[PDB]
Amino acid sequence: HYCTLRAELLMSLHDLDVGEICTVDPCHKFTWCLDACIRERFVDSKRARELQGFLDGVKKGQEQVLGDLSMILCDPFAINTLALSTVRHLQELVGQETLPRDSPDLLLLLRLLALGQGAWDMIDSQVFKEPKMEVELITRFLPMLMSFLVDDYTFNVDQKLPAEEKAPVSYPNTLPESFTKFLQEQRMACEVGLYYVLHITKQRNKNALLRLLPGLVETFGDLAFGDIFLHL
């Protein structure tokens, strides 16, 4: 929570228009995008490119700001923004027939969220190196989300097609457990899966909901049992 106040303080200084602090804090230009995204709760591609440039503008010997950026990215509302952007990107990529590995904007979202989630590690020890991603998140976890989604939509299109005989097959409610292994081994995959659970709860499909409700019982860092996802 303190990190959020830090960002707020900076924006309050930006609201005061103090060039003595706006022009010296290199994360001020970063928090332009962070404010414009957190108000929307969505990272559009333009501000994504801007964030990519700000990360690329970090030179050697001044990498402490990355820790500050991770601290600034540890704000839970920013985690909400990045997780919902990832979930909605994965929701809209099914229509275009594009895998998560074929989504450079999504890869940038994964990069930024990974840099954000390791923030307390970067303050505890002064780590100025990027956290690494998971291959199976790109190739198994997110395509398993897509697998569930597009089975649900194929069932829906079948329902909207008439001539269904007696005792129709239910939506497949079996759970692939490598998905749950990634939930209970990767905080990244964990939190994005939690926000996927919240998003399908907004979609309120009981079949996929109770399909994935097993496996959420065991999750990484008790993030499925933390304040954020429980409150949402």
Partner: peptide, 12 residues
């Protein structure tokens, strides 16, 4: 491969 088969299954 499973997801692409799921896509072509949605197209049909």
């Amino acid at each position: 491969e499973a997801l692409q088969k799921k896509f072509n299954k949605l197209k049909k």
